[PDB]
Design a protein around this ligand. Structure first.
Ligand code: LHJ
Length: 341
């Protein structure tokens, strides 16, 4: 058991081991605040997320457990993986705080597209890495569901990692990347929900502006349908939701726009990919494993450096437990964590 030390960082008190030094706050995370640190043991610069009161409710505690179990499982270059987890608590009885430790990056794609000119190659590298993380993420029967720039951490030398996987109204940017099916509650939609979100990002990288900047769920669906066209009889009987199916029919039927006329001055191979990613019916979207083979990524595609993952155990998700039973489950995982080589 290492020595801990206390530091007041933005009205909240952090208690960390000696090995983490030079703590500077960075902003928001998923259900907590994040600090940057230098890990004197491994020599890496690391982001440390402290979870804010993780055991105050049942919905909180399960989510505390959910987040830690995801990261433990993730060992991939383009996916955020757990480097360490600790707690200042000495025993289960006093145990209340969880600090997660992962790799550190410069910013997400929100803070860069502003003051950058991005050559066709920048896109090639950036999208290839997303889909590479996705292929791996999806192989463990996991969906992100909320893929967007803000959760794609990025480097000076253009390296990329994915955050907030496995975890909303008006003129807000958190909705502009959603696949229409999950946005409007349609069906057992599948993994290819994230392939839509790519298509929307890639476009924004290629054009410098948002593809579907809707003012509400409806205004956005209309923007989407203007480009990709209105559903045929095939996709209608696939929507297993009464109210949604009823609304789609009532809409004036629109044909598919010519994709070359929208994203202009862009690589023809990039265009042909977007057509295969922005398909409305998610039984006909190109899969991650398939997307890497596309001739667009010809100079990066290395099949022997595109690994899949081991199946993820999600049987804990269908269990009704109390606070202290999620707490105990979590406690066990934290003290049983063994750091990488
Ligand atoms: C510390 C941490 C813990 C967990 C998760 C996570 O996604 N968990 C769910 C289960 C999958 C993410 C992070 C996490 C990692 C990194 C790396 N870099 N940056 C980062 C730093 C400055 C900046 F401007 C942008 C940035 F992305 C991170 N931020 C802001 C983070 O929140």
């Amino acid at each position: 058991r290492p020595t801990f030390y206390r530091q007041e960082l933005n009205k909240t008190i952090w208690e960390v081991p000696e090995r983490y030094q030079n703590l500077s706050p960075v902003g928001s995370g998923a259900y907590g605040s994040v600090c940057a640190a230098f890990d004197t043991k491994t020599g890496l610069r690391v982001a440390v997320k402290k979870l804010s009161r993780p055991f105050q409710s049942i919905i909180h505690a399960k989510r505390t457990y959910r987040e830690l179990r995801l990261l433990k499982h993730m060992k991939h270059e383009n996916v955020i993986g757990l480097l360490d987890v600790f707690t200042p608590a000495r025993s289960l009885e006093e145990f209340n705080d969880v600090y997660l430790v992962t790799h550190l990056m410069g910013a997400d794609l929100n803070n860069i597209v502003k003051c950058q000119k991005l050559t066709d190659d920048h896109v090639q590298f950036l999208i290839y890495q997303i889909l590479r993380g996705l292929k791996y993420i999806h192989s463990a029967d996991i969906i992100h569901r909320d893929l967007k720039p803000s959760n794609l951490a990025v480097n000076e030398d253009c390296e990329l990692k994915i955050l907030d996987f496995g975890l909303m109204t008006g003129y807000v940017a958190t909705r502009w990347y959603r696949a229409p099916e999950i946005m409007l509650n349609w069906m057992h939609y599948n993994q290819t929900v994230d392939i839509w979100s790519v298509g929307c990002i890639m476009a924004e990288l290629l054009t410098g502006r948002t593809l579907f900047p809707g003012t509400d769920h409806i205004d956005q669906l209309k923007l989407i349908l203007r480009l990709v066209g209105t559903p045929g009889a095939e996709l209608l009987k696939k929507i297993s939701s009464e109210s949604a199916r009823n609304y789609i029919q009532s809409l004036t039927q629109m044909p598919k726009m010519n994709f070359a006329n929208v994203f202009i001055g862009a690589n023809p191979l990039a265009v042909d990919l977007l057509e295969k990613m922005l398909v409305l019916d998610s039984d006909k979207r190109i899969t991650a494993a398939q997307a890497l083979a596309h001739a667009y990524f010809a100079q990066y595609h290395d099949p022997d450096d595109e690994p899949v993952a081991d199946p993820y155990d999600q049987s804990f998700e269908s269990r009704d437990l109390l606070i202290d039973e999620w707490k105990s489950l979590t406690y066990d995982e934290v003290i049983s964590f063994v750091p990488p080589p």
